[PDB]
Amino acid sequence: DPAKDATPYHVEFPLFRSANMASADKLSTGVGFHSFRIPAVVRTTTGRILAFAEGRRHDNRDFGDINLVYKRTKTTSDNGATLSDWESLREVVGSGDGTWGNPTPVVDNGTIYLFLSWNNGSYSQKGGDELPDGTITKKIDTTWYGRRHLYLTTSTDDGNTWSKPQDLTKELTPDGWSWDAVGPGNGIKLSSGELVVPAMGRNIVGRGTPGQRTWSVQRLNGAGAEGTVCETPDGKLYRNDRPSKAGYRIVARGTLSDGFSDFASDSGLPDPACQGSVLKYNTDAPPRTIFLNSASSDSRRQMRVRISYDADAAKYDYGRKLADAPVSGAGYEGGYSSMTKTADYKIGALVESDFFNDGTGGGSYRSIIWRRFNLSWILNGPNN
Numbered sequence: 001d002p003a004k005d006a007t008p009y010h011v012e013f014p015l016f017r018s019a020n021m022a023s024a025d026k027l028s029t030g031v032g033f034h035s036f037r038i039p040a041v042v043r044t045t046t047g048r049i050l051a052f053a054e055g056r057r058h059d060n061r062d063f064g065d066i067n068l069v070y071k072r073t074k075t076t077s078d079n080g081a082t083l084s085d086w087e088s089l090r091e092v093v094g095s096g097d098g099t100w101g102n103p104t105p106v107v108d109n110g111t112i113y114l115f116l117s118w119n120n121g122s123y124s125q126k127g128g129d130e131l132p133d134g135t136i137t138k139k140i141d142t143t144w145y146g147r148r149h150l151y152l153t154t155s156t157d158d159g160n161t162w163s164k165p166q167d168l169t170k171e172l173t174p175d176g177w178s179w180d181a182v183g184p185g186n187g188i189k190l191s192s193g194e195l196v197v198p199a200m201g202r203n204i205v206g207r208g209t210p211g212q213r214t215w216s217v218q219r220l221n222g223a224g225a226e227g228t229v230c231e232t233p234d235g236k237l238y239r240n241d242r243p244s245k246a247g248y249r250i251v252a253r254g255t256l257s258d259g260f261s262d263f264a265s266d267s268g269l270p271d272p273a274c275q276g277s278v279l280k281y282n283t284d285a286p287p288r289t290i291f292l293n294s295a296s297s298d299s300r301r302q303m304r305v306r307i308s309y310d311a312d313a314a315k316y317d318y319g320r321k322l323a324d325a326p327v328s329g330a331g332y333e334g335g336y337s338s339m340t341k342t343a344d345y346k347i348g349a350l351v352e353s354d355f356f357n358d359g360t361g362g363g364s365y366r367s368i369i370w371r372r373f374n375l376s377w378i379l380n381g382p383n384n
Contacts, residue, residue, distance in 0.1 A: 001286055001307075003375035009346065010377045013083050014330040015071065016053050016368035020355065021330070025089040027069070035060040035366035036069070038184050039338045039350030040103035045110055046076040047343035050159040051086075051350060051370065052103035052114070055094070058132045059362035063124035066101055067094025068116060072159045079344045080370060092153060092162045097121035100151075100165075104183030106195050109210040111156050115182045115197050116165065118149040125179060140178050148180035149173075150199075152215075172204055172217055181225050185277050185338045190231050194256060198227035198239065205256060222263040224250060228278040233287035234311040238278070239263070240291065246273040247297050253312055268316055270297045275336040279347065281307075281375075288375070289313040290347060292337045295321075301334035303351060305378055320381030322351065322371065330367045331355035346372045 016036035017025050026032040038054040055069040071086050078085040092114065093100050102117035122131070123146050127139025140148055150173050151165040173180050180200050187197035187204075195206030195213065203218040224241030232238045232253070239252045239260065249269040254260030269291070276293030286309050295304035306319030327333060335352025342348045348370070355365040 001375070001379060004379040006374055006376040008374065008377040008380050010325045010371065010373040011081065012325055012327050012369060012371040014327065014353070014367050015051060015083075015086060015350070015370035016069075017330070018355070018365035018367045020357075020365045021367065027089055027091055031057075033067075033069070034058055036368050037352060037366050038101055038103065038336055039352065039368050040105055040183065040185055041338045041340045041348060041350050042105045042107050042112065042186060043340045043342055043348070044107055044112060044158055046158055047079070048076045048158050049073045049080045049340065049342065049348060050105065050112065052092070052105060053350075053368055054101040054103070055091070056366070060364055060366045061129070061362045062101075063099055063119070063129060063137060064121060064131050065097045066099045068092040068100040068103060069094075070159070076158070077343070079342045079346065079372070080348060081372065093165050102182050102184045104185060104187055104197055104199075106187030106189065106197055108189060108195055108206070108213065111154055111210065112159060113187070113195065113206070113213075114153045114155070114162070115187065115199075115204065116151040116153065117180060117182055118151055119147070120145060142176055142178045147178055150180060150182055168215065172215055174217070179225070184226065184275060184336065185228060186340070188229055188231060188280070191235065196229050196237065196256070198229040198241075200225040200227070203229065203237075203256075218256060218259070220252065220260055220263075222250075223252065224263075226275045228276055230278040230280050230289055230313065232280075232289060232311060232313050233283060236312065238289075238313050240266075240269075240276065240278050242275055243271060243273055247271065249276060249293065269293065270295055272296055272298050272300055274300050277337045277339045277349070279339040279341065281341060281347070287311070290339060291316055291319075292339055292349060294334055299334070301332055303334050303337070305347070305349070305373075307375070307378060318381070318384045320378045324381060325371075325373075327353070327369050330369060331365065333369055342372065346374050348372050
């Protein structure tokens with residue numbers, strides 16, 4: 001790999017700062033957030049970077065009042081290189097006291113399409129949970145009212161403004177479903193021009209052309225609830241999903257026209273049952289696929305970025321531990337992640353971090369860290 005010959009580069013700092021932090025991120029209205037979780041990041045065609053997260057208003061839990069928030073880089077050419085290159089916190093949507101989350105953006109020329117999940121504010125995945133106002137949640141069910149919905153919002157001004165979210169549940173989620181999830185993380189645009197967005201048990205596929213996209217469902221037998229999707233060097237699709245039980249990532253390969261080979265555990269990629277991220281970095285020699293998750297079967301605090309050179313991304317190197325360049329003052333790093341390729345040929349990654357002050361309980365403050373690094377930084381790591 002010629003990329004090893006470059007000087008290693010890496011910067012890292014907190015980008016979404018929880019309520020307990022100095023410079024805690026708030027909206028211009030004065031509305032603040034206990035916690036930020038569930039990152040998503042994309043580089044637009046101008047070079048601007050858009051970073052999305054769930055703004056969890058009162059505590060760190062997956063339900064209740066959660067708004068979809070974001071930051072953009074101030075300019076199209078700063079590549080998010082320093083804290084001062086990032087705009088203040090904005091909101092995509094936060095109407096009602098419902099849960100707006102699972103940001104899953106994909107760029108198409110220009111337009112940024114942002115897929116989201118939604119549920120009513122008095123429902124939760126398990127049900128039986130107590131909201132801050134005392135009320136107890138009902139379990140997510142199959143009714144229109146109590147089910148998880150799928151929304152789409154679009155921006156045609158480089159993320160500055162967002163369309164009123166459109167409910168696409170009836171069209172893009174199977175009838176009879178209760179729980180649902182899109183991403184979180186990112187969708188992709190194929191060489192052949194289709195948009196592919198990973199979702200629970202399926203791909204959401206945008207055919208047509210830029211400005212006239214048509215959305216449909218490609219079902220996937222045995223796919224995870226939280227999926228990632230990449231186009232491998234060979235031109236096929238690669239689903240790399242979170243497993244239902246801790247152990248290893250589950251993988252499947254396929255194409256849009258003739259489906260996917262069933263899902264199987266990849267023993268090279270241990271995972272604690274957490275979200276991960278994947279990135280097509282480049283196509284000419286040597287062709288690279290980047291993968292990021294917590295490389296452990298029981299902890300989320302073993303974040304590891306890896307490179308595969310394989311045409312089907314069968315095998316990854318050891319890669320590098322993100323703990324080799326730790327951040328201070330923002331909690332213990334590890335959890336969900338999202339990656340993009342910056343316009344200055346770096347990998348830009350968002351990674352969850354947890355102060356762990358109420359343990360696994362709702363009071364523990366959650367922040368999100370932004371990192372940039374070059375391939376060299378990965379390749380010149382201690383254990384390869």
